[PDB]
Design an enzyme around this catalytic site. Structure first.
Site, PDB file in Angstrom:
ATOM      1  N   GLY A 132     -77.836 -32.807  33.151  1.00  0.00           N
ATOM      2  CA  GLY A 132     -78.593 -33.557  34.158  1.00  0.00           C
ATOM      3  C   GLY A 132     -79.576 -34.555  33.561  1.00  0.00           C
ATOM      4  CE  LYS A 163     -81.733 -37.478  37.580  1.00  0.00           C
ATOM      5  NZ  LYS A 163     -81.121 -36.122  37.316  1.00  0.00           N
ATOM      6  CG  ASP A 239     -83.235 -35.312  40.201  1.00  0.00           C
ATOM      7  OD1 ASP A 239     -82.287 -35.793  40.868  1.00  0.00           O
ATOM      8  OD2 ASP A 239     -83.096 -34.946  39.012  1.00  0.00           O
ATOM      9  CG  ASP A 240     -86.593 -38.293  38.097  1.00  0.00           C
ATOM     10  OD1 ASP A 240     -87.633 -37.652  38.412  1.00  0.00           O
ATOM     11  OD2 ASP A 240     -86.056 -38.183  36.949  1.00  0.00           O
ATOM     12  CD1 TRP A 334     -83.975 -29.216  35.140  1.00  0.00           C
ATOM     13  CD2 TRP A 334     -82.660 -29.795  36.869  1.00  0.00           C
ATOM     14  NE1 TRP A 334     -83.403 -30.440  34.850  1.00  0.00           N
ATOM     15  CE2 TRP A 334     -82.615 -30.823  35.898  1.00  0.00           C
ATOM     16  CE3 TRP A 334     -81.891 -29.928  38.042  1.00  0.00           C
ATOM     17  CZ2 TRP A 334     -81.795 -31.961  36.030  1.00  0.00           C
ATOM     18  CZ3 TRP A 334     -81.140 -31.076  38.211  1.00  0.00           C
ATOM     19  CH2 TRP A 334     -81.097 -32.088  37.199  1.00  0.00           C
ATOM     20  CG  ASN A 336     -86.379 -30.501  32.675  1.00  0.00           C
ATOM     21  OD1 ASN A 336     -85.244 -30.874  32.642  1.00  0.00           O
ATOM     22  ND2 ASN A 336     -87.132 -30.618  33.758  1.00  0.00           N
ATOM     23  CG  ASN A 369     -81.604 -31.425  31.851  1.00  0.00           C
ATOM     24  OD1 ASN A 369     -80.437 -31.802  31.757  1.00  0.00           O
ATOM     25  ND2 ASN A 369     -82.607 -32.260  32.044  1.00  0.00           N
TER      26      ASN A 369
HETATM   27  C1  LIG Z   1     -85.140 -31.087  39.799  1.00  0.00           C
HETATM   28  C2  LIG Z   1     -85.394 -31.602  38.395  1.00  0.00           C
HETATM   29  N1  LIG Z   1     -84.813 -32.921  38.155  1.00  0.00           N
HETATM   30  C3  LIG Z   1     -85.193 -33.648  37.124  1.00  0.00           C
HETATM   31  N2  LIG Z   1     -84.772 -34.864  36.866  1.00  0.00           N
HETATM   32  C4  LIG Z   1     -85.218 -35.556  35.635  1.00  0.00           C
HETATM   33  C5  LIG Z   1     -84.088 -35.256  34.614  1.00  0.00           C
HETATM   34  O1  LIG Z   1     -82.884 -36.015  34.818  1.00  0.00           O
HETATM   35  C6  LIG Z   1     -84.556 -35.401  33.138  1.00  0.00           C
HETATM   36  O2  LIG Z   1     -83.516 -35.086  32.190  1.00  0.00           O
HETATM   37  C7  LIG Z   1     -85.687 -34.415  32.881  1.00  0.00           C
HETATM   38  C8  LIG Z   1     -86.285 -34.446  31.470  1.00  0.00           C
HETATM   39  O3  LIG Z   1     -86.726 -35.770  31.183  1.00  0.00           O
HETATM   40  O4  LIG Z   1     -86.726 -34.810  33.741  1.00  0.00           O
HETATM   41  C9  LIG Z   1     -86.389 -34.740  35.118  1.00  0.00           C
HETATM   42  S1  LIG Z   1     -86.414 -33.143  35.932  1.00  0.00           S
END
Ligand SMILES: CCNC1=N[C@@H]2[C@@H](O)[C@H](O)[C@@H](CO)O[C@@H]2S1
Ligand SMILES: [N+]
Length: 648
Positions: A132, A163, A239-240, A334, A336, A369
Site C-alpha cells: 500500500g 498507490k 486515505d490521503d 494497517w 506502517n 505496509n
Molecule cells: C489507512 C492508512 N493509509 C495510509 N496511506 C499512506 C500510505 O500509502 C503510505 O505508504 C504510508 C507510509 O508513508 O503512509 C500512509 S498510511
C-alpha cells in the site's frame, strides 16, 4: 525454532524417522493444498496398507474421527501429533490442515521428526501484508515469491493497493486492467488460493469520485471485472485525499451498497475492507463527526483499517481502545513498518517491535505496509506473521534471527551484520525512529567521550570498533557475491557498497587516531577524503528518486562516530602541527551550514555559492516563497530554503 510459535506444544525428548513406508489416511478428503505439501515431503517414499499410519483431514472427515476432541475449536486451528506409532495432521477447517502441514515441514529435519503434540490456532483473525506504499510497485515475480512466503508463515491476507498503480488509484481506477496486467493478476489469485491467502483487491477512488450513479456503477463494474479474474475479497481506500471524497456518510453508503448489492449477493465473497480518511489519531478530529459516523453507519461485517496514534506508530492498548470505541468494532491494523516510502534513502531491516502483545482480542486484522524492496521486507514480514499468530509468545530478536536465517541461510551472519546497522530511519517528518547498532553503542559512546577530552580511551573499545569495521567489510563483500537470493542482493546492492565504504572509512579514521607519524597521518587523511568522495558518488548516482534520493547506511551510531572522530583528530593535528587541514566530513564539490546536492538542485541546509563548473541555470527558490526562472543562463556563481536548480 517453530515460526510462528504454536499456542501449545509438548515435546518428548525422542525423535522418530520419517516413515520410509507409510499408510496415508484421508488423502482424498483433506484440503488438496495440504495434501500436495504432504506428498512432496513424502517424496522418495511410497504408500501401502502397511507402514506408519499418517492421518490427514479436517474435523468431520472420517480420517480424523479419533482426534476430534484434540482439534482446537478455532478458525484455522489444527492438531498435530508425531509419535512412534503414527502422525496426525488434523485441521479444524481446510486452512487449519494446511497450517498443520506448514508446522510439520519445519519439524522435519534430516529425515527425522521430534515426538511432539501441538494444538495451534491464530490469535488474530486476518494476518498479512498490504502492498500500500508510494513508489515502484512490486514486480510480478516478486509478488509470486511473496504469496509463497505468506503460506509458509500462515499469513492469510494480501491486500493489493500500490498507490502508484494507475488502475488502482485516480483517474484510471474506472478502467479495467489491460490484458497483460489482467492475466498477471489472475495468476496472482491462482497462486494466492494455492497458498491459502486471500487476495484482497483494493481500489482508491476518493480523490476524484463523484457521489452519483455513474461513478458508483463504474466502481461496481470494476469489482465485477476483478471478480472475473478470480478476486474474492475487496477493499475501498479513502486515505490521503481531499475534497468531496472525504464525506464519511457517502463513504459508508457506498461501502454498504457494495456490501448489499455485491458482497452479500455473490456465492463466495470473503473480506470486505475499507480504510478511512481519518486513519490514525493525530489526523482525526476529536471534535468532528467523521469516525463516529463511520462507526455507526458502516455495516458490521465491513472492516475498518487504522494506523495508530500517528501515521507511523506502534499499536498500544490505550491506542486501540480509543479507535474501537468510535468505530464500534475491532480495528483492522494497517502497520506502517517496514514501509520506507518517506525515507527512501534508508533500508529498514531491523526487528519488528513496539506493538503491545496482549491486545489480540482488540484487533480484527494486523497487516504490515512493507518497503518497495520486496525481498528485503521479508525480515519484517516473517516477524509480523509470527507476532500476529501468537503475540503472547512473540520474541522480537529471536524472530528477527529466524527470519534472516530463513531468507539467506548461506550467509545468515553476514545479513545479520548488515541488517543490524541498517534499521533506523534518520530524522523525519513522521517522528518515527528505530534502534540501530545497539551492541557497539556503549563502546562508541565511551571512545568519543574520552577522545574528545584528552582522557585516554579504553583499548578494548578501540578494538571493538576495529572488529566491527572488519566484520562489516566481510559481510558486504560476501553479500555482493551471494547467488542464493539474487533478487535480495539486487535490492540491497547500492546500500551494501555504501556500507563497505563506511567500514573502510572507519578503519582509516582509527589509523589516524593511532597516527604513528606526520607522514602516515597525512596518507590516512587523504585516503579518508577519497572515501568521502566515493560515498558522495554513490549517493548521487544510486536510487535517484524524486523524494529522498541516494543511499544512507549505518546512520544512527556508526557514521556519526566516524565523522566526529575524524573532525576531532584533524583538529588535534592542526593544533599540534600548526596546520590547516579541512575537517569537514561530507564531500561537497561546490563551495559556499553545509551545502547539499540533490539531483539537479544545489541547496543550503535550511552569502555566495560557487559551483565546480558553469551550468545552465534553471531557477532559484529562496524562503525566509521567492523564485526566478534562470532561462538556461550560464551560471557558476550565485550570491545573495535556498535552492538552485541547474541543468544536470
Ligand atoms: C489507512 C492508512 N493509509 C495510509 N496511506 C499512506 C500510505 O500509502 C503510505 O505508504 C504510508 C507510509 O508513508 O503512509 C500512509 S498510511
Ligand atoms: N475435508
Amino acid at each position: 525454532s517453530l515460526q510462528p510459535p504454536p499456542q501449545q506444544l509438548i515435546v518428548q525428548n525422542k525423535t522418530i524417522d520419517l516413515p520410509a513406508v507409510y499408510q496415508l489416511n484421508g488423502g482424498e478428503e483433506a484440503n488438496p493444498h495440504a495434501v500436495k505439501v504432504l506428498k512432496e515431503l513424502l517424496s522418495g517414499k511410497q504408500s501401502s496398507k502397511k507402514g506408519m499410519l499418517i492421518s490427514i483431514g479436517e474435523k468431520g472427515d472420517k480420517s480424523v474421527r479419533k482426534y476430534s476432541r484434540q482439534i482446537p475449536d478455532h478458525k484455522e486451528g489444527y492438531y498435530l501429533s508425531v509419535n512412534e506409532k503414527e502422525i496426525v495432521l488434523a485441521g479444524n477447517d481446510e486452512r487449519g490442515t494446511y497450517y498443520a502441514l506448514q508446522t510439520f515441514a519445519q519439524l522435519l529435519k534430516d529425515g527425522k521428526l521430534p515426538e511432539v503434540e501441538i494444538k495451534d490456532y491464530p490469535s488474530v483473525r486476518y494476518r498479512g501484508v498490504v502492498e500500500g506504499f508510494y513508489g515502484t510497485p512490486w514486480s510480478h515475480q516478486a509478488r509470486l515469491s511473496q504469496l509463497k512466503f505468506y503460506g509458509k508463515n500462515k499469513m492469510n491476507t494480501y491486500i493489493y493497493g500500490p498507490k502508484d498503480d494507475p488502475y488502482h488509484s485516480a483517474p484510471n481506477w474506472r478502467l479495467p486492467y489491460p490484458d497483460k496486467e489482467a492475466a498477471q493478476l489472475q495468476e496472482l489469485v491462482a497462486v494466492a488460493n494455492e497458498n491459502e491467502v486471500d487476495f484482497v483487491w483494493a481500489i482508491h477512488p476518493g480523490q476524484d469520485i463523484k457521489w452519483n450513479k455513474e461513478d458508483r456503477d463504474l466502481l461496481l463494474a470494476k469489482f465485477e471485472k476483478m471478480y472475473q479474474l478470480g478476486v474474492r475479497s475487496f477493499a475501498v481506500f479513502f486515505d490521503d485525499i481531499s475534497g468531496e471524497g472525504t464525506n464519511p456518510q457517502k463513504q459508508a453508503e457506498l461501502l454498504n451498497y457494495i456490501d448489499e448489492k455485491f458482497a452479500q449477493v455473490k456465492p463466495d465473497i470473503n473480506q470486505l475492507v475499507m480504510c478511512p480518511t481519518e486513519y490514525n489519531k493525530s489526523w482525526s478530529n476529536p471534535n468532528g463527526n467523521y469516525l463516529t459516523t463511520l462507526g455507526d453507519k458502516l455495516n458490521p461485517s465491513i472492516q475498518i483499517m487504522w494506523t495508530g496514534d500517528r501515521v507511523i506508530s506502534d499499536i498500544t492498548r490505550d491506542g486501540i481502545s480509543w479507535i474501537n470505541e468510535r468505530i464500534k468494532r475491532p480495528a483492522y491494523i494497517w502497520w506502517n513498518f517496514p514501509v520506507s516510502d518517506y525515507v527512501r534513502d534508508h533500508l529498514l531491516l531491523g526487528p519488528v517491535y513496539g506493538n503491545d502483545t496482549t491486545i489480540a482480542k482488540e484487533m480484527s486484522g494486523f497487516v504490515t505496509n512493507p518497503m518497495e524492496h520486496a525481498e528485503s521486507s521479508k525480515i519484517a514480514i516473517y516477524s509480523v506473521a509470527s507476532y500476529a499468530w501468537n503475540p503472547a509468545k512473540y520474541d522480537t530478536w529471536q524472530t528477527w534471527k529466524d527470519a534472516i536465517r530463513t531468507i539467506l541461510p548461506s550467509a545468515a551472519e553476514e545479513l545479520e551484520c548488515f541488517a543490524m546497522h541498517n534499521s533506523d530511519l534518520g530524522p523525519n517528518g513522521h517522528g518515527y525512529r528505530r534502534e540501530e547498532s545497539m551492541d557497539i553503542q556503549p563502546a562508541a559512546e565511551r571512545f568519543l567521550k574520552a577522545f574528545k577530552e584528552g582522557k585516554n580511551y579504553d583499548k578494548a573499545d578501540f578494538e571493538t570498533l576495529q572488529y566491527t569495521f572488519e566484520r562489516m567489510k566481510e559481510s558486504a563483500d560476501i553479500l555482493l557475491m551471494n547467488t542464493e537470493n539474487k533478487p535480495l542482493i539486487v535490492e540491497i546492492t547500492p546500500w551494501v557498497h555504501q556500507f563497505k565504504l563506511t567500514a573502510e572509512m572507519g578503519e582509516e579514521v582509527l589509523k589516524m587516531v593511532e597516527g604513528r607519524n606526520e607522514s602516515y597521518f597525512l596518507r590516512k587523511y587523504n585516503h579518508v577524503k577519497a572515501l568521502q568522495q566515493q560515498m558522495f558518488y554513490i549517493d548521487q548516482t544510486s536510487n535517484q528518486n524524486p523524494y529522498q534520493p541516494g543511499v544512507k547506511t549505518a546512520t544512527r551510531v556508526i557514521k556519526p562516530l566516524i565523522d566526529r572522530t575524524f573532525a576531532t583528530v584533524v583538529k588535534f593535528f592542526n593544533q599540534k602541527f600548526n596546520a590547516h587541514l579541512d575537517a569537514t566530513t561530507d564531500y561537497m564539490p561546490h563551495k559556499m551550514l553545509p551545502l547539499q546536492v540533490k539531483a539537479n538542485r544545489v541547496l543550503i541546509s535550511p552569502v555566495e555559492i560557487e559551483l565546480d563548473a558553469i551550468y545552465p541555470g534553471e531557477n532559484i527558490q529562496i524562503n525566509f516563497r521567492l523564485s526566478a526562472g534562470l532561462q538556461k543562463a550560464p551560471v557558476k556563481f550565485v550570491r545573495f530554503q535556498f535552492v538552485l536548480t541547474i541543468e544536470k
